[PDB]
Amino acid sequence: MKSVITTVVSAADAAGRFPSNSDLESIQGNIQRSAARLEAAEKLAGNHEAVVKEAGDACFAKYAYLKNPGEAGENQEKINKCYRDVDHYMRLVNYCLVVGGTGPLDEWGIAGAREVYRTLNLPTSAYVASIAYTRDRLCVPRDMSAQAGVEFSAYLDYLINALS
């Protein structure tokens, strides 16, 4: 779980040191940025099922070949797993805005994903079309505030650079 606190303790433990002034100075920047990304987290916590119906078919309108026979998404029990997977990925971005780091996206969503989708014949570009549609559908004074949409759209393209 990579956060701000679990990387200044894990660096102080790796040299056998007490927490010094540079370790206490990094928790202060976790306090200052906490008003921004917790505004973005409660925006995502109520509005999560709207933005995954909006971003799920943005994959399917770009890629209509998934509903071909022989392909990834034929029947209705496979389309709903694709809308399950975007809600899995949007929940972990809500977890990353709480802990203040890319911890819960890493071990729960990113690690091992490039061998899951490669073996189970899922195209990784159809995942990234759902995340990148959500990146520019955000309106920076309307939905959240200005720098609170900075850290919402900073964890979104960390997921985009990881998936490809």
Partner 1 sequence: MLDAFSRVVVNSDAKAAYVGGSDLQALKSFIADGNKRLDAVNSIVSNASCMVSDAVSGMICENPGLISPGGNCYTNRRMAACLRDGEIILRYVSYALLAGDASVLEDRCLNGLKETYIALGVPTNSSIRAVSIMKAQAVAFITNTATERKMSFAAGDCTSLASEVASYFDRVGAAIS
Partner 2 sequence: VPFSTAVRFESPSGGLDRYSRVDPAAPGPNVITRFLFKDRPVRRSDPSLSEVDREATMRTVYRNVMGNAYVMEEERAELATLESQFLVGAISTRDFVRGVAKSATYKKRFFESVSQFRFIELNFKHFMGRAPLDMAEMSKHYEIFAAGGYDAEVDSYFDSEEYLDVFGLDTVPYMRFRGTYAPNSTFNLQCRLQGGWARSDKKLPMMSMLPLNNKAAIMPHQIVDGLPVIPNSEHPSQKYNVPKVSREKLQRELLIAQGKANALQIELDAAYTSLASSRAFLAPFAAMAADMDIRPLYGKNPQVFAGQFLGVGAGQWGKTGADTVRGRSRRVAADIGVKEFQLERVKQLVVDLQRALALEDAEADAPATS
Ligand X SMILES: *C(=C)C1=C(C)[C@@H](Cc2[nH]c(/C=C3N=C(/C=C4\NC(=O)[C@H](C)[C@H]4CC)C(C)=C\3CCC(=O)O)c(CCC(=O)O)c2C)NC1=O
For residue 11, state whether it binds partner 1 (rule: CB under 8 A).
Answer: no
Instruction: State the minimum distance, in angstroms, from the CB of residue 67 to partner 1.
Output: 19
Distance of CA 94 to CAs 104, 127, 151, Å?
9, 18, 11
CA distance 118 to 129: 17
Helices (H) and strands (E) in the chain, counts: 9, 0
Q: Examine residue 114 and tell whether it contacts ligand X (CB under 6 A).
A: no
- 2: contact with a copy of itself by CB under 8 A: yes
When asked if residue 14 is in the footprint of partner 2 (CB under 8 A), the reply is yes
**Cα–Cα dist 33/26, whole Å:** 11
Output the six-digit token pair for 32: 């200052």
Q: Please name which of 149, 92, 160, 151 lies closest in space to residue 126, comparing C-alpha atoms.
A: 160
139 annotated ligand binder: no
Q: Which of 100, 102, 126, 134 binds partner 1 (CB under 8 A)?
A: 100
- Which residue ranges make up the site for ligand X (CB under 6 A)? 21, 24-25, 28, 33, 43-44, 47, 50-51, 54, 59, 66, 72-73, 78, 81-82, 84-86, 88-89, 92, 108-109, 116, 120, 122-123, 126-127, 130, 134, 137-139, 142-143, 147, 150
